[PDB]
Structures are given as structure tokens and as C-alpha cells.
Design a protein around this nucleic acid. Structure first.
Ligand SMILES: Nc1nc(=O)n([C@@H]2CS[C@H](COP(=O)(O)OP(=O)(O)OP(=O)(O)O)O2)cc1F
Ligand SMILES: [Ca+2]
Ligand code: NA
Ligand code: NA
Ligand code: NA
Ligand code: NA
Ligand code: NA
Length: 324
DNA sequence: GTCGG
DNA sequence: GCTGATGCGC
DNA sequence: CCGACGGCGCATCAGC
């Protein structure tokens, strides 16, 4: 992609606006509007000279064009400069960095004068379990995970899953599967021949084994098909500890596995494109369905490889590396 | 906020 | 007790 | 003008 020195001032401005819309205004559609605009501008291979120029791009409209004109004329946006100074809004925005504190919790905290991590720390009884864990690992959860460490993590997960039952299949998806040099977390998809579209404790026994070997250290949420938690690589006799990392584990039916793998591999942006580009078809995380004459989705087609799904749409098979 | 019925 | 709604992360 | 904009699983809240 183009160098960030091209339009980084504009992209950074739009992303900061997007965050205030999500976290303070609770205006999720304006957050996505600003993100879309920032993304289309990030990809534009020219230094923008005017709001009119940017307005030609899809997702940039009248108001972002006007903001780009103020930014180019002054190096700032009055509106952003003001909200950055605002103790209430800045504090709400900041607290949403804690995993489990969304815009609603953040506002409620700030309204009670709880505005900093220090205030959260003093008020543990006002936090739910997930929020306590997000606070405990605030710094670690914002660190990226080098690929080297992801491989070590993958080694542990695959070894322990097979130890519980050698018929499991486990696949690390997300940016790792796309060969990224670092990841934000570990996404694991799990299946087992006994669990299909029509069919005990298959997710639990895996989570329990990873806990028994002290890889999984905390649990954010855990149901029959989705686990969200925290893990940590072991360190040698005295290296400093590794950071705690986020890990998800999803149990998916065997006959929907490849649609699962495709979906959770991503990127989010690739999937949107692959879905939008689907001829008389609709693809979700579970299935690929042929749309009828009226646009109604019919029955799921059988799938025994990611490629089958590319075939159905006559889409040129991209490998995970090329789904960016 | 942007798009498009 | 329970159902359904909302918040949340992704 | 005005509605769509992603949808899922789990934790927790609101209310019967
Ligand atoms: N909000 C999201 N909704 C999605 O459907 N997705 C889908 C399902 S998961 C897949 C991309 O996965 P992630 O969200 O794990 O992001 P990633 O692994 O590509 O990136 P990162 O290394 O986790 O930062 O695309 C992603 C989202 F972030
Ligand atoms: Ca991920
Ligand atoms: Na609002
Ligand atoms: Na435009
Ligand atoms: Na948060
Ligand atoms: Na109810
Ligand atoms: Na993820």
C-alpha cells in the first residue's frame, strides 16, 4: 500500500473521528462511515490536494471533503482538537480500550467519576469478570504477537488437541493463516467427526487440557461452541515472562468446516468482497447457498475444501496469503 | 456519514 | 425460577 | 427525503 506520509494525516484524522463516534456518540454507522473513508483514502496512490479530489472516492462524501479542506488549510480539525481536550469525552474514549468495557460501560464509569485505569483498579467490585481480566492485561492485550511466538503457540495447541482425541481437527485461522509476520491474537477452529449439522463436552475437554498444561490462564467467556480466553507461552528458567495473549477457540460442525475456515481466515475486507461477489450465491460462516430467482437462499451445498466454494462462484482461488 | 431507492 | 433484550468483541 | 448499514455466541441485565 502507499506510504503513510502520502495521506496519513487525513487517515489518522478520520480514524480518530471514527473512534469518537463509536465510543462517545454511540453512532456505529458513522464509525463505519469514517473507517470506510479512511480505508479508501489509505489505498489512494496520490497525495490528496483537496476535499473535491477525495470526494471522488467511494465512501467519501460532502462532510469528509469539508473536513479534508480544513485539515489541509490548517493541519488540524477544530472539532477534534476540542473533543481531545474534553475530559469527559477523552476519558470515555480511553476506557473503551479495556476489553469488556464498551461505550455503555465507559459512559457509566465516567459519569461516576471513574475515568482512569487507576480508578478502575480501586473499583474492582464495579467490574464484571471480563472487564477485570481486560484491566489485568491492559498492556499485554495491546501488544502484537510475533509470528515466531504464534508458531510456538500453534505447536502447543495442536499437540494438546491431538492428546485429548486424535480424531479432532484444529486449524489456526486469522492473520496467522494468511502468513502475517505478527498477529493480534490466536484464532483456533476445531472440529470432530462426531459433531456435524445433526448431532458431548467436545469444546470443554480441549479447553480443560490446555488449562491443565498451563497454557490457558483465564477465561473471558465459554459456552458449548465458543471459548474466549487468555493464554501464555512458558518461559525458560529465567527469561522474563512472555506477554499474556488473547485466544479464541470455536467448535464447528464437520460438514461446515471449510466455510468456517474461509470465514475466520479473513481478512474481514476479503470476505466482504468475496460475499459481495456472489452470481446467484450467498456465503456465510456456515454454508454456501444458491439464491433463487427472487433472491431467497436455498439449501447448503456440500463442501469438502475451501476451493469448492471458489468453484461454485467461479472465483479464482486465492491462497490465504492473498486474502490480505 | 454516505449511499442510493 | 424463566424468557427475551442488550452489551460486547470480532 | 429517508432507511440501510454484518451477524454471530456468550454474559448479563430487565422484567414477568
Ligand atoms: N469485526 C469482525 N467481523 C468479522 O466477521 N471478521 C471476520 C471473521 S474473523 C475474520 C478476520 O479475523 P480477525 O477479526 O481475527 O482479524 P485478523 O486475525 O485478520 O487480524 P488480527 O491479527 O487479529 O489483528 O474476518 C473480523 C472482524 F474483525
Ligand atoms: Ca485474529
Ligand atoms: Na448518540
Ligand atoms: Na464519494
Ligand atoms: Na473495550
Ligand atoms: Na422477557
Ligand atoms: Na478474531
Amino acid at each position: 500500500a502507499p506510504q503513510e506520509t502520502l495521506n496519513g494525516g487525513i487517515t489518522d484524522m478520520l480514524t480518530e473521528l471514527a473512534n469518537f463516534e463509536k465510543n462517545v456518540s454511540q453512532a456505529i454507522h458513522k464509525y463505519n462511515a469514517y473507517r470506510k473513508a479512511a480505508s479508501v483514502i489509505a489505498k489512494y496512490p496520490h497525495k490528496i490536494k483537496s476535499g473535491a479530489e477525495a470526494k471522488k472516492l467511494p465512501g467519501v462524501g460532502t462532510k469528509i471533503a469539508e473536513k479534508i479542506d480544513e485539515f489541509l488549510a490548517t493541519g488540524k480539525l477544530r472539532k477534534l482538537e476540542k473533543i481531545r481536550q474534553d475530559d469527559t469525552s477523552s476519558s470515555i474514549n480511553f476506557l473503551t480500550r479495556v476489553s469488556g468495557i464498551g461505550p455503555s460501560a465507559a459512559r457509566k464509569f465516567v459519569d461516576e467519576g471513574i475515568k482512569t485505569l487507576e480508578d478502575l483498579r480501586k473499583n474492582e467490585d464495579k467490574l464484571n469478570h471480563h472487564q477485570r481480566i481486560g484491566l489485568k492485561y491492559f498492556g499485554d492485550f495491546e501488544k502484537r504477537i510475533p509470528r515466531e511466538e504464534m508458531l510456538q503457540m500453534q505447536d502447543i495447541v495442536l499437540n494438546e488437541v491431538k492428546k485429548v482425541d486424535s480424531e479432532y481437527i484444529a486449524t489456526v485461522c486469522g492473520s496467522f493463516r494468511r502468513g502475517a509476520e505478527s498477529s493480534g491474537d490466536m484464532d483456533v477452529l476445531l472440529t470432530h467427526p462426531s459433531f456435524t449439522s445433526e448431532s458431548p463436552k467436545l469444546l470443554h475437554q480441549v479447553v480443560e487440557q490446555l488449562q491443565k498444561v498451563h497454557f490457558i490462564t483465564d477465561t473471558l467467556s465459554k459456552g458449548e461452541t465458543k471459548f474466549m480466553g487468555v493464554c501464555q507461552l512458558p518461559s525458560k528458567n529465567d527469561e522474563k515472562e512472555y506477554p499474556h495473549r488473547r485466544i479464541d477457540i470455536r467448535l464447528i460442525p464437520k460438514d461446515q468446516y471449510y466455510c468456517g475456515v474461509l470465514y475466520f481466515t479473513g481478512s474481514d475486507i476479503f470476505n466482504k468482497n468475496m460475499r459481495a461477489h456472489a452470481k446467484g450465491f450467498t456465503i456465510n460462516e456456515y454454508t454456501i447457498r444458491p439464491l433463487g430467482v427472487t433472491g431467497v437462499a436455498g439449501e447448503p451445498l456440500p463442501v469438502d475444501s475451501e476451493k469448492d466454494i471458489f468453484d461454485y462462484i467461479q472465483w479464482k482461488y486465492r491462497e490465504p496469503k492473498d486474502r490480505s
